[model samples]
Target: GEVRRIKLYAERLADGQMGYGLEKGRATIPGPLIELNEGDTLHIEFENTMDVRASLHVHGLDYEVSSDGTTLNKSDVEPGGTRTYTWRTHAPGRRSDGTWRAGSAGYWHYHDHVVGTEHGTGGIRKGLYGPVIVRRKGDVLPDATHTIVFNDMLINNRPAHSGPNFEATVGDRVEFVMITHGEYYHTFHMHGHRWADNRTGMLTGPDDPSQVVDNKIVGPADSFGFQVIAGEGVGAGAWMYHCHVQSHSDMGLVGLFLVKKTDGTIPGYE
Candidate 1:
């Protein structure tokens, strides 16, 4: 029930890529994580510093056409221009007709909708996207969060075989926001961990019927997230999280979940 404000900047990286950042000159591939709670609102003052046109488009949130961030909606910002994109979230409830309305509580994402092609193909290909998470009031929070973007054939636009690895201590609560963009389908498989396939990625109780999964199929613009206890029942080591597509993994779509022991060492991961 509160209004939140943030400043987002779209800038060209030194490496000829584009990214979104909270501050000027700090832009990174896959941008930054945006989080919210149901019943909250966010007003993002978006600044496009790139030479080309850009916009802020989000998924699974309430917004008016004025904030659509599409050229059709006339919401895309001109190069070097600024605009405010407002997003609102609501909790689930039953309507007067006894129908259930689902709330905006899930792992969503944001990206540019107006670069290169009308679909922001160039912008997204160059790294103009980020993760968003809207939580219910009782959702469990993680000790840490990591964002993995399977962009094109690269991970976070990085080179093949070079990983954007994540680290955590044994027993730590770790969350991952897995987002896929560009062309091609991929199966994200994480070793030594699993999560429920429902909202919040955690089961309610022993009677909860959510299926547990360690790998999931995703495609362009598809996103999902989950939390797991690091090294749960497996201890500490370098667990691999990679694309299950044999060709993709062979082409360097692989990364590591380096869980460390209490003494700060990962067995055989030097």
Candidate 2:
């Protein structure tokens, strides 16, 4: 178990969107990826750089009400103000009463909780969320991790049809964190790769019985993650990952998993 301190900033982007970043001015749409191991604790020195009120709220971790990042908790930071939010994680253990507790290990996320209407609705709409990954002690690590945030009709707050494509090489162990926000439900589907529907997104054994799926349904604030071998059983190419809703796909809720061959070129894509 370790205690870590990090600085996070919430700012307005040039495109009129808002984001969270590790630096003062480099705020990105989906913010920064935060990772933690079970039994670890993190103290985020959250800095609100924007002129409006903001906050640093998170999911799937332990925190006191003061760190809740909501107006109701009075945890929202004032403009240009700074605050420290402490988050803690723990390992699974059995209690004396014989009930087992689940470990704090999963695909989680963080967002603004007070930017918009008390719920940060306006803040999240512009782009005020990020991925948080908590791994168990012996979990398998991926070669790379990518985040896909379906914020309304946009992916990572980008305009429709403009893909925030992810690149990879064949056989690489690629991880994806799929998060959803806004008022509608969506079906996230990948063209070729598949993953087990479990905590680690991998089958534990030959008879694990976990369903392997290439698509899943999600709604507001929903999040999940999985790792797959890039181009496994399929040659490197431009694979599409998109919202499966007929209307959403037509509205350009799509991006590419641009897997390249050893030669560093994707077939049929210039």
Compute each candidate's TM-score over C-alphas: 0.98, 0.98
Which residue ranges in model 1 land beyond 4 Å of their true spot? none
The TM-score between candidate 1 and the true structure equals 0.98
Model 2's alpha-carbon lDDT is 0.93
Clashes of each: 0, 0
Candidate 2 residue pairs that clash: none
Report the Cα lDDT for residue 189, model 2: 96
The models' CA-based lDDT, in order, is 0.92, 0.93
Least lDDT summed over 10 consecutive residues: which range in candidate 1? 156-165
Candidate 1, lDDT over the whole model: 0.92
Model 2 Cα lDDT, one tens digit per residue, 1-270:
999999999999988999999998999989999999999999999999999999988999999999999888899999999999999999999989999999999999999988878898999999999999999998989999999999888889888784589999998999999999988899999998899999988898898998999889999999999999999999899999999999999988889999999889888963
